[PDB]
Amino acid sequence: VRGMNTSSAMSAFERMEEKVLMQESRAQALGELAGADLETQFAQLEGGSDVD
Amino acid sequence: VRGMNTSSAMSAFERMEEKVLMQESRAQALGELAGADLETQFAQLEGGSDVD
Amino acid sequence: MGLFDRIKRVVSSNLNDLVNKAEDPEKMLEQAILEMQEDLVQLRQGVAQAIAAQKRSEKQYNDAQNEINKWQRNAQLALQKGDENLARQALERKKTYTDTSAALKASLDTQSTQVETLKRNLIQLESKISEAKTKKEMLKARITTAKAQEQLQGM
Amino acid sequence: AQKRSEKQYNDAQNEINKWQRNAQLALQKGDENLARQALERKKTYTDTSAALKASLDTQSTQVETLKRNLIQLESKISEAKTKKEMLKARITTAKAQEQLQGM
Amino acid sequence: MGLFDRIKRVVSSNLNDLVNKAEDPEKMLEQAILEMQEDLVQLRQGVAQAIA
Amino acid sequence: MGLFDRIKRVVSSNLNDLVNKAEDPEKMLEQAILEMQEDLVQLRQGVAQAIA
Amino acid sequence: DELAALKAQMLP
């Protein structure tokens, strides 16, 4: 029901939450920056031009 | 309930609040300086002007 | 007053070294969450002991009542026997026990009220720790932003 | 952190919804006490959520400002590199000139 | 007062260094899994004694 | 308290190293097959003794 | 208040 922090049931929930939050935040920030760059947007337009 | 110094939670809260408030005021001043600069103000105005 | 001044100077120097080590918010926060939970467990153990004590007193009170009943049965037997002395001894035992029981009951009632208050307090404490966790998350986000802002401000 | 708070807010809303479902079940059961307990849980959670939302809005504004600041910083470093090149050329010329002047 | 602060700082410093090493996803999950299984076995022995 | 937590973390790391050495399926499988048969024989012998 | 709300649901 309570026990100690060392015990697996209480500790596991805490570790997973911290790890998940950190991983998600880092990935999201990196993705936004790539989208922001002008060249990536241009490439999609270029592909359409290349196709015709 | 007393809010005495010996309790760990009470001591931590007081120190954190004071530091955060000072930092926030400093942060606001830094933000104001960026706003104060002509170039930052000009860019927002320029974007509206540039598209038309 | 000179001695006091020297002590104050030494104390101030010691305090300055200590605060810097514990200045970081995260280190302080980790200690606080662990401590309150530990305190609650200790409080629960104390509450359990109090509850056990209350149960023991009730059992003792029941035992005292049972003892009085046993004495009454002996007194009835004495009446059948027809010996005046045997009956008198039983009566004396009943009277002292009854006085003790009355005192115990008054003490038990006071103890019970205190125990009930403690249980209510424990429920309030549970709400408080949960609130603190939410507060901690908000504080951490603000602190990270502030540190970044200060560096930017310096440039 | 902002994402986590939003997730927490969503979780709180979900928890409130779960409590509401329990309350509905209690009404079907017909037990007054069960329904009352569920209502109490909803009220405390709602108050916490409101406080969290206000905090989140303030945090979001700060985050947006930081992102804007970062963009400005990127422009500044690029400008500095150009400035450095100009400075280096001037410095080399000055050193040579000083020696010539001495003669 | 000063001694208490020093003790808290030492404990906090030790905990901070310890948690990062401790917080490994593969190790933490495995340790938790091992502990719960062991606990269940102990409970069965206790139950047997009660049954006995 | 801190030492106990530290030991658990160390144990988890140690456990991970140990399983890797014995991770291969064939060595473990042969041993398991031998063990169940041996256990059955012991049970059979015990059963025979009981029958006797 | 909850009882009144519950009664309304029961009504229909």
Numbering used by the authors:
A (entry chain L), B (entry chain K): 156 to 207
C (entry chain P): 1 to 155
D (entry chain V): 53 to 155
E (entry chain Q), F (entry chain R): 1 to 52
G (entry chain A): 208 to 219
Sentences reproduced from the published study:
Proteins that perform these functions include Vipp1/IM30 in photosynthetic plastids, PspA in bacteria, and ESCRT-III in eukaryotes. Here, using a combination of evolutionary and structural analyses, we show that these protein families are homologous and share a common ancient evolutionary origin that likely predates the last universal common ancestor. This homology is evident in cryo-electron microscopy structures of Vipp1 rings from the cyanobacterium Nostoc punctiforme presented over a range of symmetries. Rings have an inner lumen that is able to bind and deform membranes.
Strikingly, the cumulative helix α5 rotation (Δϕ) between all rung interfaces plateaued near 40°, indicating a strict geometrical bending limit. Remarkably, this maximal rotation within the simulated stacks closely matched the measured experimental Δϕ in Vipp1C11, as well as the cumulative ∼40° helix α5 rotations observed for Vipp1C14. Thus, the simulations suggest a simple self-regulatory mechanism for limiting ring stack size where stress from inter-rung rotation builds up until the formation of Interfaces 1 and 3 is no longer favorable beyond a geometrical limit of ∼40°, after which further stacking is impeded. When membrane was modeled into the Vipp1C11–C17 structures as a 4-nm bilayer, sequential constriction was observed with the membrane lumen reaching ∼3 nm within Vipp1C11. This is close to the biophysical limit required to induce membrane fusion/fission (Chernomordik et al., 1995; Kozlovsky and Kozlov, 2003).
